Design a protein around this ligand. Structure first.
Ligand SMILES: NC(=O)C1=CN([C@@H]2O[C@H](COP(=O)(O)OP(=O)(O)OC[C@H]3O[C@@H](n4cnc5c(N)ncnc54)[C@H](O)[C@@H]3O)[C@@H](O)[C@H]2O)C=CC1
Ligand SMILES: NC(=O)C1=CN([C@@H]2O[C@H](COP(=O)(O)OP(=O)(O)OC[C@H]3O[C@@H](n4cnc5c(N)ncnc54)[C@H](O)[C@@H]3O)[C@@H](O)[C@H]2O)C=CC1
Ligand SMILES: NC(=O)C1=CN([C@@H]2O[C@H](COP(=O)(O)OP(=O)(O)OC[C@H]3O[C@@H](n4cnc5c(N)ncnc54)[C@H](O)[C@@H]3O)[C@@H](O)[C@H]2O)C=CC1
Ligand SMILES: NC(=O)C1=CN([C@@H]2O[C@H](COP(=O)(O)OP(=O)(O)OC[C@H]3O[C@@H](n4cnc5c(N)ncnc54)[C@H](O)[C@@H]3O)[C@@H](O)[C@H]2O)C=CC1
Ligand SMILES: NC(=O)C1=CN([C@@H]2O[C@H](COP(=O)(O)OP(=O)(O)OC[C@H]3O[C@@H](n4cnc5c(N)ncnc54)[C@H](O)[C@@H]3O)[C@@H](O)[C@H]2O)C=CC1
Ligand SMILES: NC(=O)C1=CN([C@@H]2O[C@H](COP(=O)(O)OP(=O)(O)OC[C@H]3O[C@@H](n4cnc5c(N)ncnc54)[C@H](O)[C@@H]3O)[C@@H](O)[C@H]2O)C=CC1
Ligand SMILES: Nc1nc2c(ncn2[C@@H]2O[C@H](COP(=O)(O)OP(=O)(O)OP(=O)(O)O)[C@@H](O)[C@H]2O)c(=O)[nH]1
Ligand SMILES: Nc1nc2c(ncn2[C@@H]2O[C@H](COP(=O)(O)OP(=O)(O)OP(=O)(O)O)[C@@H](O)[C@H]2O)c(=O)[nH]1
Ligand SMILES: Nc1nc2c(ncn2[C@@H]2O[C@H](COP(=O)(O)OP(=O)(O)OP(=O)(O)O)[C@@H](O)[C@H]2O)c(=O)[nH]1
Lengths: 497, 497, 497
């Protein structure tokens, strides 16, 4: 059980088309024959599936010891029905076009599941950042954008890179600075070419913790749904149950704190080295220190090394957040859990899905969970496309206008019950007192994220009941994804051909 | 005491770096040695200080008598950490690269003190507009932009000119029309290349009086601060004290009315010709007529000519708003005032500062006062970048929604106290009645300006206490300025070098 | 014996580097250590070898029956040391990135062997032109350029497509017309984006027969070299020996006529269907008719069907001109020939080379033979980059000036021997009479091609003796190729890295 990662995501898309194909002909309003309309649907589905562009590079670089190297680099743009196309830049010696093509596809559907205006994209670099000088990573990241930009694969109108595995705000700043100063110098939207930038360079409050909140608001939108918890046989709530984490990195890290702050007791955590198992809870603050002190989660003196993979650890909510294809046909029989959230991108093989549906354990699709990161990188790309600190124009104004609603209510009452002259004191609460001056930059993020992953969780529930998919929310997700991208191709007069 | 105007502003920047350098190493989070980190700070400070681009021109023109002339023209772009770069266009026979370089620097800090997304810039033209036909000024202004545009010094992504000395809305319209019709024709943001345009050409309510409000809200934010007025030995309030004005032009003019309407009695006013001294108040309306009738503030029959410079006149609030370096080591001993506001750009020599701190008289930095003009020209550049009359989308909607808050409150009460059926009339006040339909174009200006210069006045107070700078708010201003521009260079991975 | 076609061409490049590496260190003039210089050479060699860009596409098309299809399309740009990059566009259901990458590499060396200023490139389309309407091929070819152009893979400054397998002047006209009218409309060099265009659309006399002349002048430059014919044991001349042809298409066709007109008796010919064997000669005119009448070379009533592959036919000069990898380890033992020319691109597997060197049969590298086609498509790209019919400016002038050389010689003699008054008639010959008006468009082609493949044949001979490669001219060719591309990288300061 190790399919070509692109043949796998295609496999999910397949079961999606196998169910939509019927409810999609009846919504096609053209005037043709029944079979003809189906010969129209299946055709458009064959256009969605493949990637529309897969660039492939090679970089002469000069390492600090003067020697040269080549660096294969990739970038796919899955679909063009929606511009621009976002997608992270991954640094790993395990990246390939067969991987990038699929990760590129997912973000075409992630962005469709959470209603974000972007096509899919993804860029890889065969590289191990743990090997190279922090000068060499600059000469590599800047060259990698110099190559893309001149071939039309970076720019606020075509593609928007983003952080991903083994990349952070450090790299994303090198990109925005190279693009702004070479190609899109005159363009007013220069700095808006990448997301995940540092705050001082045009970022957004909580771009790092963005994905974590995703995993959080996702789990919350289901744990607090009794219709499934009655099936899974658990309790709506967090402090009553626990969870584990694969891949203590950005997702895994912030998936903890936001899920740790509400009573859910993070049992264990692991990484490429080993596992750290404590059935009583690990402080996400303290462990975060060792990643900056001891280089690994190992040695953590408030837990122990675990002779076994996290995926088999007894818990309540499994969260693979480290790499692809981790759960598989050989790990599925030994999960011993109830819910498998997904921070990583397609961490479950399609063979293991049936076993999970068979074992009666709910799998929440990665299309829905790690989509939080996108929906915040959208606010960033949209922040620095308007050139204004959101809400700055109307801080002093909203603060005044609200002080005149409450006043008018007061002045109005002091004429009806004011016969005694009694001063009715209409004053804000503690909560409203914060929201007087309006929506600050952080407020729309903590809301626009919690809202985007509210509508999405419904549209997934609303579908899985319409088609009776039970706990295969994944298939229900692709249905909502495919139905949306279809109406774009259908009405667009797909081509000039 | 007549330093090179660029060696002067550098001198202020110096005393700024001399205090930040310590509290800035500890905020640098890189992993190096102490001395190394200081070898990193001082280096970045040497990058901020100089101008990154100083163009220099020469114009063949054809005067109306057919003769040719050359016209030296300058433009500096101080820093590029923030695009675009705004900066006025000054017409004076006293402009030079040594001047423009410094005025360019100030606006890099002005924009940093009031948190406005622009680098600094400034453009000069060795010219005397009082000499040339109002046709020749067009052939000069249009040629001056034709030259800049083709070399990448005008355009909504690089630079945005603005009014300044001896230029008004007349000139700024010639620029926007030349740029829109030659270089950026196809660009959607063509007309957004300059600010200070006429309203019919995309201006903003009160762009002329914008700078005056700055000087006003600045003074107000300090006069109403007892912590200093206890030191200066005066009273928080305006009608109890007076003020004078140097340079009756745009700043000086509107600095009067907005400071005249609140009881502060404008004692005198002067210009290149002479002074007009009346210890009982000059009507800013009446005097404004003579500038359009008698060509000068002289002859004003409700005052007298003053055999002396304004800077020595007895008053309470001195406002130099005419030119640079006016106060100096020779004028400082004879100020006879309490507060010296600054409408002009660096009207005080650094030598006179010590004398002012010694004489125990508070000097409000020009970085803070005339920054109002920028913060409104930002709203303009941001108005005509969105292509919509701000608030037009939601006039009829907010008006309705507010009529349903007040109604719901009424309908809610008529069920609790409505046992008598008594019609509770929840109706807006007089004030709220204006703010029903929402934020109009003028409302955000009168607020966004009053708000921007609220946060700034605090950050300056908040610093001058943290470092104990007493009344040298100027040094406190640069500290806040330098700390902000530093975090941009620091995190940006300053160069690809 | 069926290596990955890119692992094969790499294999030749390898044996090339294995011999140059020594004679290339001594020509490196930098000041380093011996081993260091070798750590510099091997590094640059690792930069040359891989492709710098390999795009990959997918086309929604609308077949005439209304159904949709996807069409994978590829394009590689091997190297960028020389812009633009030429390369054909092949239509075949057997194309893939693993093929295009190598064919792209060859043209980086072809162009280096014949000193033509282009990097390598190649574009494929998984398609069978024998299946689609001649309308559908237009909707496919135009879309394929629309996709490339917007991503910077067509244009006289980056890439220049050209005819190749299953494409002719029909397709190349659709490309030039689509590019000229969409992307490079304003560009003055629009129509110069592709070569192989029809004459009326900016072609060159004999662009079709261009490659054939290549195969001809190549063979001639060796057959008339006794130094090898003494080794091979044959006779310098054509009418005394015969030859066969694989792949009667463009190359194979015109390889016949130009080699048929000089006595060499074309024995047989074959194609995807079958062979046509006549040991007495096939009229290239008559057989050309059946390709336009009977759809195949079969049925040709002046020969017979041959139960066997051409590659084993007894002859004197074998010319595979149909596809890749035709000769191989299984066909090498049964060649029964003396010289194997190569019209096709790498039609010989590296394993069969040793067998050919062992069997003492000379293999002429495809790098040298089919390079004629490029050297004419260069004249085209250079014709329509100058916007003038070459030689038109000086037809009437050269005709006059020559009539004054011959006259002056006459007038000069009629003073020395003119004592008798005898009219010396200095008049042109028959041959010169043609070349009076100068170099017409066709003359430079028939010369610039015959000349380009003169210098190249020497530099290959001049190398194979310097290094004693005997009859492995192929390895001698790559040596001259690598030595040239190396001096470009070496001196260029290879990167900004
Ligand atoms: N971080 C983000 O912004 C986003 C991340 N994701 C997904 O989340 C996943 C992880 O987040 P990242 O930020 O990439 O974390 P990261 O970039 O910090 O690295 C993940 C960590 O997991 C560990 N790990 C990697 N492979 C492993 C394996 N096979 N077994 C055990 N441990 C392993 C590594 O030590 C690494 O520290 C990624 O796979 C990505 O697909 C998706 C969207 C946004
Ligand atoms: N290089 C570029 O083109 C960049 C452009 N931008 C744009 O600027 C706007 C900034 O808004 P926000 O940062 O959200 O406001 P904000 O109030 O969130 O500002 C965040 C930080 O930026 C600093 N800052 C503000 N103005 C500055 C200036 N003129 N110079 C140096 N530092 C300054 C402030 O001190 C604050 O610490 C964004 O909308 C973005 O579109 C932002 C970053 C880089
Ligand atoms: N007006 C604006 O939009 C802004 C102005 N400023 C600063 O405000 C100052 C004045 O405002 P402007 O609009 O330029 O005024 P303005 O362009 O109307 O001219 C200033 C007036 O002051 C008088 N004056 C000039 N030099 C003088 C001297 N040495 N002694 C006595 N009188 C003199 C002149 O007669 C002139 O009428 C300028 O120096 C400029 O740096 C700063 C930001 C924006
Ligand atoms: N040349 C250009 O490209 C210009 C573009 N603009 C853009 O147009 C927008 C206009 O909004 P505001 O002026 O703030 O609205 P507004 O309500 O403030 O309009 C101000 C004046 O413009 C006049 N006006 C409005 N639409 C007009 C039209 N179609 N033709 C002639 N006059 C008209 C109105 O009568 C009004 O007196 C701005 O956002 C600006 O971005 C503005 C000026 C010039
Ligand atoms: N024609 C040109 O302009 C140039 C051609 N070449 C090379 O010359 C070769 C042939 O020239 P083209 O113009 O492509 O000819 P073409 O495009 O007319 O087709 C070649 C012919 O050979 C036959 N053929 C193909 N594969 C075969 C196989 N496996 N067995 C038997 N017969 C087969 C086909 O029936 C076809 O008619 C190509 O492989 C190409 O690499 C190289 C440079 C320029
Ligand atoms: N669409 C475009 O931009 C094209 C531009 N060109 C340029 O035009 C130049 C033409 O030179 P050659 O064709 O080598 O000269 P040529 O003497 O070889 O002309 C070849 C044919 O073109 C025809 N022709 C010449 N001028 C014409 C015109 N104004 N309208 C229609 N047909 C005409 C002639 O009758 C002749 O049959 C080339 O240098 C090429 O650069 C050529 C073809 C297409
Ligand atoms: N690595 C790390 N990041 C943190 C930590 N605390 C907060 N952050 C991030 O830094 C940002 C600033 O935190 P706050 O000032 O508390 O604002 P906030 O958004 O209310 O913080 P949260 O509610 O925890 O998301 C947050 O949005 C988080 O994304 C922490 O302890 N460790
Ligand atoms: N030169 C000059 N300008 C004026 C005068 N009165 C108003 N203005 C400017 O013209 C604009 C229109 O004035 P109003 O209709 O009163 O609107 P406003 O913003 O409430 O006016 P103010 O509150 O005085 O700023 C104002 O914003 C001022 O900038 C005046 O008497 N003389
Ligand atoms: N298919 C085909 N093409 C031909 C034939 N004869 C000539 N051509 C091509 O058409 C062009 C015009 O031929 P010519 O007028 O004889 O000029 P040319 O260049 O002297 O012809 P060649 O010397 O045979 O190359 C030639 O350059 C050939 O490329 C032919 O019989 N069949």
């Amino acid at each position: 059980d190790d399919p070509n990662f692109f043949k796998m995501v295609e496999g999910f898309f397949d079961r999606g088309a196998s169910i939509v194909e019927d409810k999609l002909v009846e919504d096609l309003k053209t005037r043709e024959t029944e079979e003809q309309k189906r010969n129209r649907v299946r055709s458009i589905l064959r256009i969605i599936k493949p990637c529309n562009h897969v660039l492939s590079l090679s970089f002469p670089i000069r390492r600090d010891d003067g020697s040269w190297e080549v660096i294969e680099g990739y970038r796919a743009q899955h679909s063009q029905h929606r511009t621009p196309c976002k997608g992270g830049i991954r640094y790993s010696t395990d990246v390939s076009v067969d991987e990038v093509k699929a990760l590129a596809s997912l973000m075409t559907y992630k962005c469709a599941v959470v209603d974000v205006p972007f096509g899919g994209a993804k860029a890889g670099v065969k590289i191990n950042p743990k090997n190279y000088t922090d000068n060499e990573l600059e000469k590599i990241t800047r060259r990698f954008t110099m190559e893309l930009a001149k071939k039309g694969f970076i720019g606020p109108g075509v593609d928007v890179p983003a952080p991903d595995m083994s990349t952070g705000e450090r790299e994303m700043s090198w990109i925005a600075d190279t693009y702004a100063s070479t190609i899109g110098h005159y363009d007013i939207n220069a700095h808006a070419c990448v997301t995940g930038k540092p705050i001082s360079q045009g970022g957004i409050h909580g771009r790092i913790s963005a994905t974590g909140r995703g995993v959080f608001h996702g789990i919350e939108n289901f744990i607090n749904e009794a219709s499934y918890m009655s099936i899974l046989g658990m309790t709506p709530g967090f402090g009553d149950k626990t969870f584990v984490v694969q891949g203590f990195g950005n997702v895994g890290l912030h998936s903890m704190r936001y899920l740790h702050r509400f009573g859910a007791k993070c049992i264990t955590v692991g990484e490429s080295d080993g596992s750290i198992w404590n059935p009583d809870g690990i402080d996400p603050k303290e462990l975060e220190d060792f990643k900056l002190q001891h280089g690994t989660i190992l040695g953590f003196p408030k837990a122990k090394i675990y002779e076994g993979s996290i995926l088999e650890v007894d818990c309540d909510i499994l969260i693979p957040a480290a790499s692809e294809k981790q759960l598989t046909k050989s790990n599925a029989p030994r999960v011993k859990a109830k819910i498998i959230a997904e921070g990583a991108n397609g961490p479950t093989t399609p063979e293991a899905d049936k076993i999970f549906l068979e074992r009666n354990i709910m799998v929440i699709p990665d299309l829905y969970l790690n989509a939080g990161g996108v929906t915040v990188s959208y606010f960033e790309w949209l922040n620095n496309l308007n050139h204004v600190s959101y809400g700055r124009l109307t801080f002093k104004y909203e603060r005044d206008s609200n002080y005149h609603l409450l006043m008018s209510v007061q002045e109005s009452l002091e004429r009806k019950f004011g016969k005694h002259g009694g001063t009715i004191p209409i004053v804000p609460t503690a909560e409203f007192q914060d929201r007087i001056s309006g929506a600050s930059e952080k407020d729309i993020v903590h809301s626009g994220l919690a809202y985007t992953m509210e509508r999405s969780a419904r549209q997934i529930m609303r579908t899985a009941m319409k088609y009776n998919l039970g706990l295969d929310l994944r298939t229900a997700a692709y249905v909502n994804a495919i139905e949306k991208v279809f109406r774009v191709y259908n009405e667009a007069g797909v081509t000039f051909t």
